[PDB]
Design a protein around this ligand. Sequence first.
Ligand SMILES: *[C@@H]1O[C@H](CO)[C@@H](O[C@@H]2O[C@H](CO)[C@@H](O)[C@H](O)[C@H]2NC(C)=O)[C@H](O)[C@H]1NC(C)=O
Ligand SMILES: *[C@@H]1O[C@H](CO)[C@@H](O[C@@H]2O[C@H](CO)[C@@H](O)[C@H](O)[C@H]2NC(C)=O)[C@H](O)[C@H]1NC(C)=O
Ligand SMILES: *[C@@H]1O[C@H](CO)[C@@H](O)[C@H](O)[C@H]1NC(C)=O
Ligand SMILES: *[C@@H]1O[C@H](CO)[C@@H](O)[C@H](O)[C@H]1NC(C)=O
Ligand SMILES: *[C@@H]1O[C@H](CO)[C@@H](O)[C@H](O)[C@H]1NC(C)=O
Ligand SMILES: *[C@@H]1O[C@H](CO)[C@@H](O)[C@H](O)[C@H]1NC(C)=O
Ligand SMILES: *[C@@H]1O[C@H](CO)[C@@H](O)[C@H](O)[C@H]1NC(C)=O
Ligand SMILES: *[C@@H]1O[C@H](CO)[C@@H](O)[C@H](O)[C@H]1NC(C)=O
Ligand SMILES: [Zn+2]
Ligand SMILES: [Zn+2]
Lengths: 497, 497
Amino acid sequence: VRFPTMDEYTNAREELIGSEQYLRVGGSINLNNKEKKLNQFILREKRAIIENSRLNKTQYIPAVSFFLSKSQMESTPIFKIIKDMPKGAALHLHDTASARIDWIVSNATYRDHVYMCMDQDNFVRLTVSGTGPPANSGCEWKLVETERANSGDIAAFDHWLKSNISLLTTDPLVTYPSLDKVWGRFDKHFSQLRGIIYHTPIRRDYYRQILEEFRSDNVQYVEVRSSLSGYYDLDGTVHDPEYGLQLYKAVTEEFVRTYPDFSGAKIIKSTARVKPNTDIFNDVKLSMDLYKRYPGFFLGFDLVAQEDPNTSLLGYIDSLLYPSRQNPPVSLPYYFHAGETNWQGTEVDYNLVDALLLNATRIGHGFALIKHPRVIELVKSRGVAVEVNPVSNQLLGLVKDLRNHAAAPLLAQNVPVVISSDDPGVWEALPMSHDMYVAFMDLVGEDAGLDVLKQLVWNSIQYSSMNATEKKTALKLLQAKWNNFINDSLIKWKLTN
Amino acid sequence: RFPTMDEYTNAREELIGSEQYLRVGGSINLNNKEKKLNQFILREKRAIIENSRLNKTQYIPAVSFFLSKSQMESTPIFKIIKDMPKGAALHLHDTASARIDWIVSNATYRDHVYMCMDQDNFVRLTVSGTGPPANSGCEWKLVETERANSGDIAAFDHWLKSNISLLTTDPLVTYPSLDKVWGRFDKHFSQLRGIIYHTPIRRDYYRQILEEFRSDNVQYVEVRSSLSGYYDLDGTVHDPEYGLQLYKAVTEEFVRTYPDFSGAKIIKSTARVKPNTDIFNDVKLSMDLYKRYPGFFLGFDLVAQEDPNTSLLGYIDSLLYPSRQNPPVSLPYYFHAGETNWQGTEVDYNLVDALLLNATRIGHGFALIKHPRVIELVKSRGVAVEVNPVSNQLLGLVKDLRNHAAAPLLAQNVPVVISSDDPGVWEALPMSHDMYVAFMDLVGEDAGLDVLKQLVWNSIQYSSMNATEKKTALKLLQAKWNNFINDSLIKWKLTNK
Ligand SMILES: *[C@@H]1O[C@H](CO)[C@@H](O[C@@H]2O[C@H](CO)[C@@H](O)[C@H](O)[C@H]2NC(C)=O)[C@H](O)[C@H]1NC(C)=O
Ligand SMILES: *[C@@H]1O[C@H](CO)[C@@H](O[C@@H]2O[C@H](CO)[C@@H](O)[C@H](O)[C@H]2NC(C)=O)[C@H](O)[C@H]1NC(C)=O
Ligand SMILES: *[C@@H]1O[C@H](CO)[C@@H](O)[C@H](O)[C@H]1NC(C)=O
Ligand SMILES: *[C@@H]1O[C@H](CO)[C@@H](O)[C@H](O)[C@H]1NC(C)=O
Ligand SMILES: *[C@@H]1O[C@H](CO)[C@@H](O)[C@H](O)[C@H]1NC(C)=O
Ligand SMILES: *[C@@H]1O[C@H](CO)[C@@H](O)[C@H](O)[C@H]1NC(C)=O
Ligand SMILES: *[C@@H]1O[C@H](CO)[C@@H](O)[C@H](O)[C@H]1NC(C)=O
Ligand SMILES: *[C@@H]1O[C@H](CO)[C@@H](O)[C@H](O)[C@H]1NC(C)=O
Ligand SMILES: [Zn+2]
Ligand SMILES: [Zn+2]
């Protein structure tokens, strides 16, 4: 008889469950006594919300649309703890989508020579024109200063601007109920802001706001995708990508000199995968040059824009292999978005295969990765972190209930993962706290606590592209922040026994 | 590493080929005729996926069954799967596996059938030979009278069907939460309970399961049944052994009539809402029926909604009782387990207990991909997972079926059988709808006839037939398969004339 007594059965059961706990993200962390006090509180709070949803037969709010869950999570202790927690790094961000729309309205649209129009889809667009009103080809441009002053209600005018640009004005899962409809709205958002956010002094100040906002959410480091190109002055001068990089380098250096508690930022050049192979070839050659001349600030290259309907990595493969085929070879790092899809066995999810054959340093999303066991082996073996952006994947159509997020089985296998926010400004998310809350409540289990959070935070620095010296310094800083956070939390939640 | 495209191509195809060999069916070698059909299926699959992907429209095989049912039935892939022999349906509930149309057109035309509108405004049906039933919470009326006075009998009969089926409206819209749709599902069983437990109707309903499954080219079924409480017009209530004998006699007559049908076996099910003291008696009952009906009675299962009700651990002394006897008794178990979106809770840890108790097959295992050690145990022991994709969508575990959690199981060749669960409740065919959605949503664009063939063979190889029965059934399946291949080449004009 295998299990003659309850003790024989529970021994076997607990060993099996415990063995799985040891294998998931964070499973090897040993919390100290102060961390354990906070962990026990976090776990009591987590069990209360889950058991209420399960036994009282009501929806699990952390997993529903961000439109519905945002205001509900923000009043809760677990969210308030994650808000205070140091996050380490946000490694997957886009530079035109990472600061508040409120700042675009309250700051940028109060500058001279900003114009607005309603396009033929009934969306507001914003741009800058130094010479005069822009040509009235597809819409009638009007000076924002005049429209605001004539609105008869300035606060309502500004709120309307914000409402007409944000993807969280209504629930995207209701208003744009298909992949194509919501990506239509997402694409439109960037068209709405493109003119104003490419004007050089606004773009400079917007990048500074990214750093300020991320610091204010207790993020100490960011790596940012940027096209770098086409920043334009009031007189019409258009700058090249190297200028865009130098501009970001100077903002970043000023910021880190102001805030020693902040580790800094580095940049990845992104190009939209709707362009011909000759454009990607030129941007690859550009990236080779910037990688050589800005070591330690310019990281490498990525291809962006919607993955499903546009060009695969294989479609650009001669361009992407060009660095490695030089004599001597040139090693241009790649940070490919890859597998941001529900498709299986197609040109889209097979981008994961090409991303690994091209030696990607990290991969963006990897939503399809759990369908590719041989790619998982390579990702684990090589230490290629997967940048998981859970709110983005829900709102942009890959999943509805976030407990079905395809990164939950990755985390259960200890695939290297970092959490990030992707385009938080587009849908009114915080730099990291909302995405970290939904990862913690939806993508790991009821009995997963502070150890998961600590591991994800440490991962974001460990799998950053900092050099060894920078990384050692950043981890010492993170450890200090973490200690202060534990001590402060014990006092705040009245856990000091 | 890749000086030319040929070297890059070779590495890419080696990695993709490794994944294709690993997944379900990857080791099958198709013959020349099967390859011709395979090439047509793959051409059809690529055309529909590429149209969805490149023309930016929804992928109909993955949307709500309410919307996709009428669309898939006109397509060649569906028609091929319809004609295909399925082998076995191994996961079925006996009060939910024949057509509601038969309940209406046959059962509700029988003498002594009554109907009433309950307090939730649903029709309920029952039989009473000894006068009309007492007006306890509803007012019973003879159906024969209600029908004859309707003024439109076609509309009356259609109203009955529409008031009972869960596919009258889209459940994802009408009942848009787990608790709401399970409320509707539970209500469906309440609507039919009275009529479907009347002995001659139950007998004839079970015969209709066999007729309908045979007509969808299924040759064998294993069926969960509560067995107990069938009642006669004079009020006699029968015991579970009688219910088992009733099904045994129907099955034997069916196989005499149709030697091209392999037959059926029965699993006793009990609802997991009962006190542990009552489950103990159902385990003892199952031990006795297993001893005395070897080869027809298979074992035991616990059913009803998994999330809010009792876990396997809550019944553990009852479930361990057979193994603890002197001498031990090996009562086989077929546990529904992990039919849930929860992680790290009592519900998904039912999978651990299912394995410790040596389950022969596991029902659903939706949460299994979150449990890497349980997966390895399932693979090494050959415990088949019964995957019921339409059920999991309509009853609230997933919306886009390409997010179904069995797709990563099939990619690692976890042993899986496809089944339909409760097809009569939502107007599905015995197997062809579930096999179509598994084929179109749970494996990739490059997965063809080898996946179908493997899942069909799996349904016999992981059945509970003894070894001699399996060999007989596989010879019968092979002949059906060969006829299906030849017929398909002629029907789809593939013979290369
Ligand atoms: C962007 O703003 C426009 C202009 O206000 C909105 O269009 C209006 O939408 C309302 C609904 O509240 C319609 O009844 C009106 O007819 C529209 N007015 C005009 C002048 O066209 C539009 O809905 C906003 N779009 C978004 C996504 O918020
Ligand atoms: C089952 O049948 C009842 C009775 O016909 C339906 O009741 C009707 O419900 C609609 C609302 O959807 C009302 O407008 C009607 O007045 C109701 N009629 C009566 C006589 O009450 C009920 O909707 C049906 N339920 C389902 C799920 O189909
Ligand atoms: C269910 O809700 C009630 C209040 O409506 C509360 O008393 C009870 O604790 C809840 N159960 C759980 C497990 O949260
Ligand atoms: C906008 O930000 C710039 C740069 O920080 C600042 O100088 C200016 O005062 C701001 N405008 C408003 C209206 O606050
Ligand atoms: C990828 O990395 C390996 C090991 O460092 C190297 O030998 C190979 O050339 C690289 N391949 C490419 C395509 O850069
Ligand atoms: C997209 O639709 C057009 C017009 O119906 C059709 O010609 C084209 O072949 C479709 N594309 C694909 C890839 O199916
Ligand atoms: C119902 O089925 C029974 C038993 O198979 C059959 O004898 C009877 O004719 C059927 N009733 C109708 C209305 O078809
Ligand atoms: C499970 O099976 C093993 C191997 O057949 C056997 O030794 C063991 O006693 C069984 N356990 C239970 C709980 O029935
Ligand atoms: Zn991104
Ligand atoms: Zn079932």
